[PDB]
Amino acid sequence: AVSQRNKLILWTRGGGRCYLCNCALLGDLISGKDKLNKGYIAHIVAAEIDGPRGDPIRSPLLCDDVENLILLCDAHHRLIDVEAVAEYSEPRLQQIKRAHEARVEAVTEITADRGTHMLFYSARIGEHDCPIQAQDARSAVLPAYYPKDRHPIALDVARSEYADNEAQYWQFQIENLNRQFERKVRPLLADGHIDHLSVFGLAPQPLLIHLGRLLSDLRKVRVHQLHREPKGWDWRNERPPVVYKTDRTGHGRTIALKIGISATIVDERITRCLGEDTTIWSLSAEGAHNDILHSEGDLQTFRSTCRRLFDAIKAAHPDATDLHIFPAMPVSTAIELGRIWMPKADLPLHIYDENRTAGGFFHRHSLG
Amino acid sequence: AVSQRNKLILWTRGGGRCYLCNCALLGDLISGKDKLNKGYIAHIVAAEIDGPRGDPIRSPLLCDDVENLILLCDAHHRLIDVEAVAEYSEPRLQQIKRAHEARVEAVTEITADRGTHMLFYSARIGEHDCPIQAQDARSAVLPAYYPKDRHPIALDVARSEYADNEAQYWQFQIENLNRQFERKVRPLLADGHIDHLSVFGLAPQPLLIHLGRLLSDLRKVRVHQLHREPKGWDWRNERPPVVYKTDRTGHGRTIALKIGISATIVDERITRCLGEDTTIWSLSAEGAHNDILHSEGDLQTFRSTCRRLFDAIKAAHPDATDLHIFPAMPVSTAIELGRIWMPKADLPLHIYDENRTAGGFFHRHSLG
Ligand SMILES: [Mg+2]
Ligand SMILES: [Mg+2]
Ligand SMILES: [Zn+2]
Ligand SMILES: [Zn+2]
């Protein structure tokens, strides 16, 4: 008889399907319908010397050799053993066997990769009080991804002797994010060992938008959000979906977009900063607060909503100079704004940041 | 211990692959490398009451139940039993089991006659930032087809020191598309090595139409579209069908057709570069935007609409020598335009391209 191990090997290699018609044999095996041929195993060289394609030497030599076995439903076992023996010689059955098993392996191999690389963008990476820590990141990617390497790729929000309201800070942080990406990320992407990137960013919104721009050409990226109670970076999905809705005020030719997702922004702060002659488009979340981005669906609906608004804005204003962005966005949406921006389909973006020391909005960074 | 029959069932349903990374386990099973966990079987609810997700009632109830078993390599068995027990809850592991076994069955169902060759037309084929990659293509042909060869056939939008706004560039790309097609595709067709062809094109629309013309006589072709959110080349089916509208303006001697599916094209832009003595036919999609081609039905309905429009244009202008095409089309529709054009009955096509930064439409290619 055929060993249980050879049965397992052949059924795995054969995908549990008839090698001539591909029909599914597992359900019948479980049902015990394999009374004529246990396990639906067919011998190419018959185990019996007097059988179809039998041989006095090779029949006993091959009766428990998996390289001599195929799976057949009862009908097609009868076809190669009784009705059409001459049609199905050892080489022809052997070639159907290789081809069936090669095909099965190739299709079960095709699937998205689960392994991911963590990318951190934050101040104080590697220090005791860093708000993104490797053990919290490695847990947060499960179970949708698993860490392919234990250690994150570290992009530093580098320590600086300039404050958020001095231009000096923004030039230093932008060029330093640029050097950093071009130094530790690009060579690993070029090299091809990274197939999925899990992103954990905590930085001023203009820098997070630039990070998103740097990630825009990548195919496998999952952005994470810092959640607030309990603190952590794992996606949750426990609340009703965030409701976003778009609007506009004014009719000047300076096009602005305020994005009030974690907070509200009144139109005054934009007109006080831009001209009085403005059009202020709006992307708002109902109940805007800094813990509003709860679930990945919330992030996807932001991406698609923001995409629709970007199209609508350029369609409504075919005389484009730029678009002036005024954000109050969770870190995950700020990265995704930069990631979905299309360098030559969208308007160029001028990103404003609230000077929290004294005074309102100031232009700190641009895309395009 | 787990029965030999349940081991066979699980190994067949699982395709002999780790349910967390999809790596192949049979070779290691045959080699006796399954020293820590025999057969690479992991219990979701542990067989041991004291184990991960163990239970005094359900552990013995399920220790020989195939619905509680998965296949795992040693590293991911340790991931769900030691490192990340809480993250990998029974419901989350059950999802993975159901998804893994559903995919394995659906892909092994694809019969041997459904094999396909991937054909790429794009810049930067084989580089990390190419927007068409072998792994996304081979996933995209499933479950309708399976890749007959692991490697795509690469037609390059070849690098040159020419710019798209000078004629030499277009002449260069056309001879290179012709040469590569004649040597990498055609010689394999005659014998039957290449039969069904799955096509992934990302190129300037006039070159994509030419690609379609090169495919025009082929009987087995499936064109793919590059989608956004999520990125990928797999056909989707989540939206209402695209709505197409055919219309016409003017009564002039020179016949034009604008095809605004991913964007709108106003009549000016046709009027001169061509003149005022024009008839401007139109084939537009309601809500034209760059991700509008969602489903394979949307592409088929484009084919039939464009076919009907071509006939109507020929009937309406029996003294017309040719037709001036002004496209703003998804990549898949552009290929299919070239593929359905009939030299026998249709007007010759002069294809125009939007000159970036200079501005305006310029004649870059012709068919017939
Ligand atoms: Mg037999
Ligand atoms: Mg276990
Ligand atoms: Zn059969
Ligand atoms: Zn694994």
Residue numbers in the entry:
A (entry chain A), B (entry chain B): 4 to 371
Q: What are the paper's exact sentences on this?
A:
Here, we present the biochemical and structural characterization of two CBASS systems, composed of CdnG and Cap5, from Asticcacaulis sp. and Lactococcus lactis. We show that CdnG from Asticcacaulis sp. synthesizes 3′,2′-cGAMP in vitro, and 3′,2′-cGAMP is the biological signaling molecule that activates Cap5 for DNA degradation. Each monomer of Cap5 is composed of the N-terminal HNH domain, the C-terminal SAVED domain, and a short flexible linker connecting these two domains. The structures revealed that both Cap5 form homodimers, resulting from the side-by-side packing of two HNH domains.
On the other hand, two SAVED domains in the structure of AsCap5 are close and make contact with one another. But the two contacting surfaces are not completely closed and a gap between them can be seen. Therefore, the structure of AsCap5 can be best described as in ajar configuration. Importantly, unlike the two-fold symmetry applicable for the entire LlCap5 structure, the Front of the first SAVED domain of AsCap5 faces the Back of the second SAVED domain. Therefore, the two-fold symmetry is only applicable to the HNH homodimer. The HNH domain of AsCap5 (AsCap5-HNH) is significantly more structured near the active site than the one of LlCap5. Specifically, a well-coordinated Mg2+ ion is only observed with AsCap5-HNH, and nine residues of LlCap5-HNH near the active site are disordered. We created a model of AsCap5-HNH in complex with DNA•RNA hybrid, which revealed that part of a loop in AsCap5-HNH has a steric clash with the DNA strand of the modeled DNA•RNA hybrid (colored black). Based on this analysis, we conclude that the configuration of AsCap5 shown in Fig. 3b is also likely to be inactive. 3′,2′-cGAMP might act as a glue, bringing two SAVED domains closer to seal the gap shown in the structure of AsCap5 (right).
